[PDB]
């Protein structure tokens, strides 16, 4: 007769509150895709308009979810990720999708295909306010490979709601999105009702059509700004120490930085704390190029948590960059920092000493193009339609009807000027 704790639609907002820099939310999304359970090799992040609503889409060629798995994805605290073949999941907390989506927008939807079934899931605050739900209820609809609805009681109710309050009015509209995942397997997440201050979405899409950006009016709270603070592309480059996945933003793929070609006078150092059985490597180099952005780069489970943390000499030391990965440390709610523990503290302390050593030893020597866009021609328009990078192969011929890009899915849609 014991009760269960309950979830209030209001909570959905609350959970967002730890993300004070939007890219943190996005990064959460990318991670879910990168993770070995999903194991996608490409993720496409895009801005589009649907139904008069600006949208953000995250689409990946990955394993996708069973309908049940989707429920958990829309539930709080469930995570079962495990390392595979040395691919270590970032996921731990079972919370990242909810905080991120919601940080990003009021309403979201998930389309997933696992190659046996395909399902659609709904998380909207807007929806919930409207029906005045006292509980967070997540509608889900599932289909057979033959697009036959297969869990009817849930599915019919889910569908009615989705269709009514969703961005997509008719099944056809849903199935289009489902079909934007070209592979047999994969997932597409659409977020709409994006945060806006004044009358404009929080992000700036105008400044660069090939980036998602934060408007100048930009530096993060902590500290002249590295690009990663304000450019999603720049950020994405340094996101993973050893990439396993391709991130494509705005249809242009992202070029991962390599330490070689990025740093000079490189040297290796080690950390051998008392509290750890294993050694931890560190890499130190001076910064070529901008040489206003230096610090430790802290990576956890191969992902970047903090950048340009200044250690030792906060002036006295500059242009020095250190790269380290600390699996022992524990990330914060937004994964932009570690829990502030003695161990974290010891580590910071050590890095500065280690770095300090580096400066002095080296210190002496130093003192002495975008890729082309791709289009496909429709065979029933003869019109040319833009294509995102990262597609290995296509069907024998291509029609505007099967355009993943929502905006050019009609043959009747004027062709897009190529770049001037």
């Amino acid at each position: 007769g014991i009760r269960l704790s309950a979830l209030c639609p209001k909570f959905l907002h609350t959970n967002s509150t730890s993300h004070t820099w939007p890219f943190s939310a996005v990064a959460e999304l990318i991670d879910n895709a990168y993770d070995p359970d999903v194991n996608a090799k490409q993720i496409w992040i895009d801005k589009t308009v649907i139904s008069d609503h600006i949208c953000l889409t995250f689409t990946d060629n990955g394993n996708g979810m069973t309908a049940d798995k989707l429920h958990k994805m829309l539930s709080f605290g469930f995570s079962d990720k495990v390392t595979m073949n040395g691919h270590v999941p970032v996921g731990l907390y079972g919370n990242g999708f909810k905080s991120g989506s919601m940080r990003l927008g009021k309403d979201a939807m998930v389309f997933t295909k696992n190659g046996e079934t395909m399902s659609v899931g709904f998380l909207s605050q807007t929806y919930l306010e409207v029906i005045k739900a006292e509980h967070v209820v997540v509608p889900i609809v599932t289909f057979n490979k033959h697009r036959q609805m297969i869990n009817l009681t849930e599915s019919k109710a889910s569908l009615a709601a989705i269709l009514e309050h969703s961005l997509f009015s008719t099944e056809q509209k849903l199935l289009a999105e489902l079909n934007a995942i070209m592979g047999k397997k994969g997932t597409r997440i659409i977020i709409w009702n994006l945060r806006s201050y004044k009358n404009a979405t929080e992000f700036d899409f105008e400044k660069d059509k090939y980036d998602i950006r934060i408007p100048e009016d930009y530096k993060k709270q902590e500290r002249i700004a590295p690009e990663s603070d304000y450019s999603l592309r720049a950020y994405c480059s340094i996101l993973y120490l050893k990439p396993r996945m391709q991130i494509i933003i705005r249809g242009q793929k992202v070029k991962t930085q390599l330490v070689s070609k990025s740093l000079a006078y490189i040297e290796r150092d080690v950390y051998r704390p008392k509290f750890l059985t294993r050694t931890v490597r560190i890499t130190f180099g001076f910064n070529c190029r901008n040489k206003d952005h230096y610090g430790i780069m802290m990576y956890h489970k191969n992902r970047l948590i903090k950048a340009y943390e200044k250690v030792g000499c906060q002036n006295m030391g500059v242009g020095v960059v250190g790269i380290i990965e600390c699996n022992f440390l524990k990330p914060t709610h937004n994964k932009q920092d570690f829990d502030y523990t003695n161990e974290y503290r010891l580590t910071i302390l050590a890095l500065g000493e280690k770095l300090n050593d580096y400066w002095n030893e080296m210190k002496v020597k130093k003192n002495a193009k975008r890729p082309d866009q791709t289009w496909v021609q429709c065979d029933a328009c003869l019109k040319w339609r833009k294509l995102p990078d990262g597609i290995d192969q296509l069907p024998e011929k291509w029609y505007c009807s099967n355009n993943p890009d929502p905006q050019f899915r009609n043959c009747e849609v004027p062709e897009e000027p190529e770049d001037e």
Partner: peptide, 10 residues
């Protein structure tokens, strides 16, 4: 299908 390549300029 038919794919053409064009330059992207900042």
């Amino acid at each position: 299908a038919r794919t053409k390549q064009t330059a992207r300029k900042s």
